């Protein structure tokens, strides 16, 4: 379903845009329903949960007699749901704002996060918006730049910081948005070096053999060294075997 919004550069410039979900993990539409083994009927089974205290007598506590809490070190601090909603971070939903512009070399692919890719086109039946979006895309492509932007699906959606980069094709041109990591999402792990390791240094024969192996197992073939490459094993066109 199309997602309408406005790409805003500051408080004076606004371009109407529509976003679609291009690539995402696909799951089964129909789930497994638990049925009674004998009668084979759904309505013959009922799942429920109960809460009991940790005392020896195993007292019974109702769902209205419990609250939500968190852990703060070695102690536990109560934090009710209403209090959390009152103290919750509140933001204005449906925001697509350009925080800034940065060189493409500074946004690495390995830092991409999330579970979606968004394709942003101009608003349907809108010539001015299309012209503005085309101008922005062409400028970004010419300058080799990407836009660091803030994205929020709706009011009750956590804000995200992502990167939008141009994608120009002979048929259509559009922006491609992918989420980017926060400060808390980065892991700082140190690994030993391999080049400088004395006991893990391959010899000339090993390197030659590995080169031969790589050459023999090529999955792309040049078209008689004339125009371009051709893919022997395209994995994008293979249907998911799980559903099959």
């Amino acid at each position: 379903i199309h997602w309408p919004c406005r790409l805003t550069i500051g408080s004076n410039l606004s371009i109407r845009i529509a976003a679609y979900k291009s690539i995402l993990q696909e799951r089964v539409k129909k789930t497994w329903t638990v049925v009674d083994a004998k009668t084979l009927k759904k309505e013959d089974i009922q799942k429920e949960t109960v809460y009991c205290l940790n005392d020896d007598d195993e007292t019974e506590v109702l769902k209205e007699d419990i609250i939500q809490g968190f852990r703060y070190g070695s102690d536990i601090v109560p934090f009710s749901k209403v209090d959390e909603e009152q103290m919750k971070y509140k933001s204005e939903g449906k925001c697509f704002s350009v925080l800034g512009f940065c060189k493409s070399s500074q946004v690495q692919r390995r830092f991409f996060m999330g579970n979606q890719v968004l394709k942003v086109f101009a608003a349907r039946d809108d010539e001015a918006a299309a012209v503005a979006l085309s101008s922005l895309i062409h400028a970004l492509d010419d300058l080799d730049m990407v836009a660091i932007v803030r994205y929020a699906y709706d009011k009750r959606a956590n804000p995200q910081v992502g990167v939008a980069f141009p994608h120009i094709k002979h048929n259509y041109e559009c922006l491609v948005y992918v989420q980017l990591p926060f400060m808390e999402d980065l892991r700082q792990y140190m690994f030993s070096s391999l080049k400088n390791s004395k006991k893990y240094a391959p010899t000339e024969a090993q390197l030659n053999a590995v080169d031969a192996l790589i050459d023999s197992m090529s999955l792309a073939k040049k078209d008689e060294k004339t125009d371009t490459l051709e893919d022997l094993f395209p994995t994008t066109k293979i249907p998911n075997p799980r559903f099959q």
Binding site: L99, G100, I148, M183, Q188
Partner: peptide, 24 residues
Amino acid sequence: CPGESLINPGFKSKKPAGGVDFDE
């Protein structure tokens, strides 16, 4: 090792977030 944090040894000290700062 240079840059090691003084609170959690063995982890790189993270520079404070500066957000967006436009260049000259």
